[PDB]
Short mmCIF file of C-alpha atoms in Angstrom, two decimals:
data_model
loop_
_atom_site.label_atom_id
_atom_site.label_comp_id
_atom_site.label_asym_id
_atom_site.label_seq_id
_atom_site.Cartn_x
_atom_site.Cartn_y
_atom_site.Cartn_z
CA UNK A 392 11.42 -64.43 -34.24
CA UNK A 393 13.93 -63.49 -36.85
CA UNK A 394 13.77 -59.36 -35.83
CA UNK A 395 14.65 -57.07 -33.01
CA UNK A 396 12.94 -55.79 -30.33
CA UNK A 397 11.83 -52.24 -30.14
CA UNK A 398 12.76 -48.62 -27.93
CA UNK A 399 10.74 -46.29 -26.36
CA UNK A 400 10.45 -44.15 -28.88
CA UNK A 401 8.99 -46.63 -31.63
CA UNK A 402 5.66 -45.06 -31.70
CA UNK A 403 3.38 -44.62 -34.10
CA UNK A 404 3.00 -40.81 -36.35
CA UNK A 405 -0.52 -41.28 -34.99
CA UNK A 406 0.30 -41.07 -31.35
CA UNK A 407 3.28 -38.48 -31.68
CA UNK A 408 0.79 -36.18 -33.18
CA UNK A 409 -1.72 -36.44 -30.21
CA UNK A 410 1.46 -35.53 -27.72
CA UNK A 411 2.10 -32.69 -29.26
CA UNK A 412 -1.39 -30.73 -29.50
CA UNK A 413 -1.71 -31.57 -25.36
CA UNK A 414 1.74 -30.56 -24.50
CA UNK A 415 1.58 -27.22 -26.42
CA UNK A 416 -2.07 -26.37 -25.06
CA UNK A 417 -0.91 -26.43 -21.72
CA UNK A 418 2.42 -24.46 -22.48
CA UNK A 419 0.57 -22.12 -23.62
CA UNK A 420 -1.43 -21.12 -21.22
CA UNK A 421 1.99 -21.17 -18.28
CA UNK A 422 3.90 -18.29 -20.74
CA UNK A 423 0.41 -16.28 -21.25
CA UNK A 424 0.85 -15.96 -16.95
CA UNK A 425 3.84 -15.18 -16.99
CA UNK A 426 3.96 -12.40 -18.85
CA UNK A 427 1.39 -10.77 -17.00
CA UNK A 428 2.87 -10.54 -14.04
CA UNK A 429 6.26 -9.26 -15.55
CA UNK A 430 4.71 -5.85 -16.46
CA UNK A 431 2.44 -5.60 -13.65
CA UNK A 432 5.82 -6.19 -11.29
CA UNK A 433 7.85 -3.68 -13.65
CA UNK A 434 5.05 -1.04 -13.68
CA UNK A 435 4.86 -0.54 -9.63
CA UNK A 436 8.61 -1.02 -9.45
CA UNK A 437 8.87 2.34 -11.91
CA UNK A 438 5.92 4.14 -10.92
CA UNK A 439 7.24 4.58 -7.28
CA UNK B 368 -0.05 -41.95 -14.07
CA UNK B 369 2.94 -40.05 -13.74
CA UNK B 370 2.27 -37.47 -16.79
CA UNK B 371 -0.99 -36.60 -15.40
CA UNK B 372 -0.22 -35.29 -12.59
CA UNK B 373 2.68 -33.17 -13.96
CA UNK B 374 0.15 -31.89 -16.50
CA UNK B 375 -2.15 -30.75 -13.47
CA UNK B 376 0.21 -29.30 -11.65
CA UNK B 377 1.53 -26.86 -14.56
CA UNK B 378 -2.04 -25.78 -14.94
CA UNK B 379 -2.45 -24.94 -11.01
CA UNK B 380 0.72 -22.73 -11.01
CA UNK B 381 -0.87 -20.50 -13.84
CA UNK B 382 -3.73 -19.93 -11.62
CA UNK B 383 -1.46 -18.68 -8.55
CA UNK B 384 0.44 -16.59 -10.79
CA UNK B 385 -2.80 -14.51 -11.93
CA UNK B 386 -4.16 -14.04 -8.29
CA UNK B 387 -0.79 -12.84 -7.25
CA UNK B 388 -0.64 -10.33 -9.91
CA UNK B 389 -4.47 -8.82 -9.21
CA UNK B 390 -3.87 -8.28 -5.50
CA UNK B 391 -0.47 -6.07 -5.65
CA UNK B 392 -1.68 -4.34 -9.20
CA UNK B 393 -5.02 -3.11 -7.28
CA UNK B 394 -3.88 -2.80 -3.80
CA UNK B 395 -2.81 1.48 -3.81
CA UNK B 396 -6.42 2.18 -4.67
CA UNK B 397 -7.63 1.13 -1.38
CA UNK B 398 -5.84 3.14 0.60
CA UNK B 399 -6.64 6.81 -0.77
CA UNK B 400 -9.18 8.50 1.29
CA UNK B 401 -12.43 9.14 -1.38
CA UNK B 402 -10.14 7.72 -4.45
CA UNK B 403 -12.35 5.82 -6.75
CA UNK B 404 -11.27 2.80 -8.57
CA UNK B 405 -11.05 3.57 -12.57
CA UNK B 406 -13.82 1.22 -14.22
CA UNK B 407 -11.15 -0.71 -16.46
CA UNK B 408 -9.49 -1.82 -13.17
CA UNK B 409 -12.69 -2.26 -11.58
CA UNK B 410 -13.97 -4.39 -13.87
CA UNK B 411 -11.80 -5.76 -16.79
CA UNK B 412 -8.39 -5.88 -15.04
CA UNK B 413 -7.05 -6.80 -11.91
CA UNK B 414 -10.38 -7.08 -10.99
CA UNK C 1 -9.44 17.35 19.99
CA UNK C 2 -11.89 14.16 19.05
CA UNK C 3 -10.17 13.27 15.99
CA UNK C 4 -7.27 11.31 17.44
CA UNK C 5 -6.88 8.66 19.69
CA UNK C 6 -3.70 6.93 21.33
CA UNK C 7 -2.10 3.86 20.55
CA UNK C 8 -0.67 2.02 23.66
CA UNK C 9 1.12 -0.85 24.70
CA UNK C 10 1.42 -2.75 28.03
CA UNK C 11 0.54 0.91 29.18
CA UNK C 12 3.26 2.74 26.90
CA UNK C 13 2.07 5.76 24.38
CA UNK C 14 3.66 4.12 21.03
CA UNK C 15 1.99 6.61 19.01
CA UNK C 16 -0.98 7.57 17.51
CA UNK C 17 -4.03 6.77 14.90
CA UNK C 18 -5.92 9.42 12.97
CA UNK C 19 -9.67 9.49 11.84
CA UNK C 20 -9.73 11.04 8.63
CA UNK C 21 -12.59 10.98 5.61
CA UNK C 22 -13.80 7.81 5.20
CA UNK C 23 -11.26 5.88 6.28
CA UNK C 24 -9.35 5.14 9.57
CA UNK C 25 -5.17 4.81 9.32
CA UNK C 26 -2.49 3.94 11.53
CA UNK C 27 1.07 3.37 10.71
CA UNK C 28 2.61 -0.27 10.25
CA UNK C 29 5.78 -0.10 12.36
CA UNK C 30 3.56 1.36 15.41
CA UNK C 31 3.08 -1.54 17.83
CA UNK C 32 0.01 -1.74 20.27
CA UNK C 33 -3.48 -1.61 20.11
CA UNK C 34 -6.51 1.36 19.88
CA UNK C 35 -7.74 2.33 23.15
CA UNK C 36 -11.37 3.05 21.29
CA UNK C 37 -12.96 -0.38 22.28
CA UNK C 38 -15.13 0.01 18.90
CA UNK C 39 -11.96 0.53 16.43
CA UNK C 40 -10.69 -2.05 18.07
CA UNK C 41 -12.48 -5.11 16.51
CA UNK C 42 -11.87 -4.06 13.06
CA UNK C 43 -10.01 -6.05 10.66
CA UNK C 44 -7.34 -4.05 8.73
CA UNK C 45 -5.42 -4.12 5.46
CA UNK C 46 -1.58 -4.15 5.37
CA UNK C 47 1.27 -2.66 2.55
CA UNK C 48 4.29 -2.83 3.51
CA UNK C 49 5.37 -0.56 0.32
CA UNK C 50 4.10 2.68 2.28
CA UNK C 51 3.84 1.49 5.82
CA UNK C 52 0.34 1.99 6.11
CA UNK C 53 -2.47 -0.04 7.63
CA UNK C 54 -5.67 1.77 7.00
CA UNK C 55 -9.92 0.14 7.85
CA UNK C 56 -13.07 1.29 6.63
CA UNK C 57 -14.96 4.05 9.36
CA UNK C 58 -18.13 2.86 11.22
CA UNK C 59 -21.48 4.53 10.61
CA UNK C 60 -21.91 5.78 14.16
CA UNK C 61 -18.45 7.59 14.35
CA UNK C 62 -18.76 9.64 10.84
CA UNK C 63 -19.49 12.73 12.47
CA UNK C 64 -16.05 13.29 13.48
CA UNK C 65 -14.55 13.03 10.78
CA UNK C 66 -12.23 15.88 9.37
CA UNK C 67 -12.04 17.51 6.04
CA UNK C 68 -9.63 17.46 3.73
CA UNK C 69 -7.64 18.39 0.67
CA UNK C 70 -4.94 17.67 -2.44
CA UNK C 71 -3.61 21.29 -2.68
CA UNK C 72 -0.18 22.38 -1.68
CA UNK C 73 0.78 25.68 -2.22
CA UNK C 74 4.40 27.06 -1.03
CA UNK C 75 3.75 29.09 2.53
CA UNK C 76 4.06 28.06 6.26
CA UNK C 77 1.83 25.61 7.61
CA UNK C 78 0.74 24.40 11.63
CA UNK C 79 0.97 21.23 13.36
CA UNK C 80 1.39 20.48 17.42
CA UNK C 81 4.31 21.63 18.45
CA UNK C 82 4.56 24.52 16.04
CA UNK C 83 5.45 26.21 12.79
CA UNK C 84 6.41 24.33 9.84
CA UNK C 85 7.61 25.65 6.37
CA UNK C 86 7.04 24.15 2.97
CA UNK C 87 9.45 25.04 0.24
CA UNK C 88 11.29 22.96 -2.20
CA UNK C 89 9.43 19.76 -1.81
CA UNK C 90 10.22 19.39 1.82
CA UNK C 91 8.74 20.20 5.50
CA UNK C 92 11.07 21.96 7.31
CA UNK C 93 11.37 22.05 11.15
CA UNK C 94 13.33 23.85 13.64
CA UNK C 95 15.74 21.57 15.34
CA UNK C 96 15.07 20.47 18.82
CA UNK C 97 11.31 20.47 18.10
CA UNK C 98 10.01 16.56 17.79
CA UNK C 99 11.47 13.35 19.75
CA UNK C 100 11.03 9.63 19.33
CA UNK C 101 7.65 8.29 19.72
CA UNK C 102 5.32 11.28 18.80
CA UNK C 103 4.72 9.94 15.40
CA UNK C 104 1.23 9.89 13.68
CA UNK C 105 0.54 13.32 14.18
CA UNK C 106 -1.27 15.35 11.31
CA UNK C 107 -0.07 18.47 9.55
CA UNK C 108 -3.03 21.11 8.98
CA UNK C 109 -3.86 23.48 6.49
CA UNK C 110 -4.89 27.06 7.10
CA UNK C 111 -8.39 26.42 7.08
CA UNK C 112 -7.79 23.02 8.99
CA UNK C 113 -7.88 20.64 6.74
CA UNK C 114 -5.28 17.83 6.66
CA UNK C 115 -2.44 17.22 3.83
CA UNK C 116 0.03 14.96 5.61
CA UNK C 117 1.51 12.24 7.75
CA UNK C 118 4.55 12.51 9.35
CA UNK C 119 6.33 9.01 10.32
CA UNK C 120 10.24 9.47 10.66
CA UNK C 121 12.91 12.45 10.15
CA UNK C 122 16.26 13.61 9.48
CA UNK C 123 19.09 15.35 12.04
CA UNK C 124 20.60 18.31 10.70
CA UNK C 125 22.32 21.10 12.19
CA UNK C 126 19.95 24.45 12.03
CA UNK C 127 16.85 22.75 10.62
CA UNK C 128 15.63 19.20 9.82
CA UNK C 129 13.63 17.21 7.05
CA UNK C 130 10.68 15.23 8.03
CA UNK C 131 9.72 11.89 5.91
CA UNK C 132 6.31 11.63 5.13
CA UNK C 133 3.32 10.09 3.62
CA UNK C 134 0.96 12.16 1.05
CA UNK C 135 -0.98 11.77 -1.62
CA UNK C 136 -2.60 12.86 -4.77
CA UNK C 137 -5.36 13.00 -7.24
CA UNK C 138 -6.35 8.98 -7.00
CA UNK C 139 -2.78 7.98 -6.13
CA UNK C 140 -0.21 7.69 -2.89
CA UNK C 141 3.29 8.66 -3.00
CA UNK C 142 5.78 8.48 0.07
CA UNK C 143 8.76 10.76 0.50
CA UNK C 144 12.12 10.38 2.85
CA UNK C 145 14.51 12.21 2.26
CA UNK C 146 18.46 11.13 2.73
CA UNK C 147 19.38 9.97 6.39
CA UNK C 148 15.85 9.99 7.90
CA UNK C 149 15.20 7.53 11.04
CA UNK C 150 11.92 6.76 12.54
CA UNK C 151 10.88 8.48 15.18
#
């Protein structure tokens, strides 16, 4: 061959749009959680 | 393989999280003698 | 008379539960078990925010149950081993009167009717602060005041 070989990140615009709709769905729903708990924690703390 | 099971076990914390936050938010309302639980907390939140 | 029962341990008085409304409720840091041998299969619920432990009340034992009420006007109220006085936000007792391991006992009303906990209190020279658990209109609130033990 007269070329190089390629890295891990030679992908296709294709495929790096796929990873990012699944990895931001699931984000998502972990900060949603979180902030649930953080006033429900907050809220007894203060009300005692 | 590997990415998979990170993905699940993100999604299984989330879960934990919620039940933790329902059982120490309703908790006080069980202990007053003839205090009725609002219906918002009874049925919307913390439920 | 039939509205409280002893808590003991390897045949020690530890202290005491109280049958009250609806509900049945002993104190968390009391160790032992319930000599009634019907209260004693029931599960229980524990916080450790307000040291209670409290069960729901079997059908067959509702009768005994005694009455009571939110209101706290300033005055004197009775209990056991006494007079107590209200005033300020806190139960005052004569000191001398109360030792270790007579906790659990209820305060009463004029008419009877029961407003209070007491679990713990403070030394001080001519009288002395109790710490107890009350409550309000759908909510419970606990109050110690500075240097209480438990008793």
């Amino acid at each position: 061959a007269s070329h190089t070989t390629l890295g891990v990140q030679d992908i296709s615009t294709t495929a790096m749009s796929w990873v990012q709709k699944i990895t931001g769905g699931v984000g998502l729903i972990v900060a949603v959680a979180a902030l649930i708990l953080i006033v429900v924690l907050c809220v007894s703390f203060s009300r005692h | 393989s590997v990415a998979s099971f990170v993905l699940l076990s993100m999604v299984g914390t989330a879960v934990g999280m919620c039940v933790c936050a329902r059982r120490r938010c309703i908790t006080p309302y069980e202990l007053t003698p003839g205090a009725t639980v609002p219906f918002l907390l009874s049925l919307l939140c913390c439920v | 008379n039939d509205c409280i029962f002893e808590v003991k341990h390897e045949g020690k008085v530890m202290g005491y539960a109280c049958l009250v409304g609806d509900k049945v409720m002993k104190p968390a840091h009391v160790k032992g078990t319930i000599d009634n041998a019907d209260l004693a299969k029931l599960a229980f619920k524990r916080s450790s925010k307000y040291d209670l432990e409290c069960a729901q009340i079997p059908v067959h034992m509702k009768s005994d149950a005694s009455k009571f009420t939110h209101e706290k006007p300033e005055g004197y109220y009775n209990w056991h081993h006494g007079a107590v006085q209200y005033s300020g936000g806190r139960f005052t007792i004569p000191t001398g009167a109360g030792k270790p391991g007579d906790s659990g006992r209820p305060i009463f009303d004029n008419k009877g009717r029961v407003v209070a906990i007491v679990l713990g209190g403070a030394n001080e020279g001519a009288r002395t602060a109790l710490s107890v658990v009350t409550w309000n209109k759908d909510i419970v609130t606990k109050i110690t005041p500075e240097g209480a033990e438990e008793w």
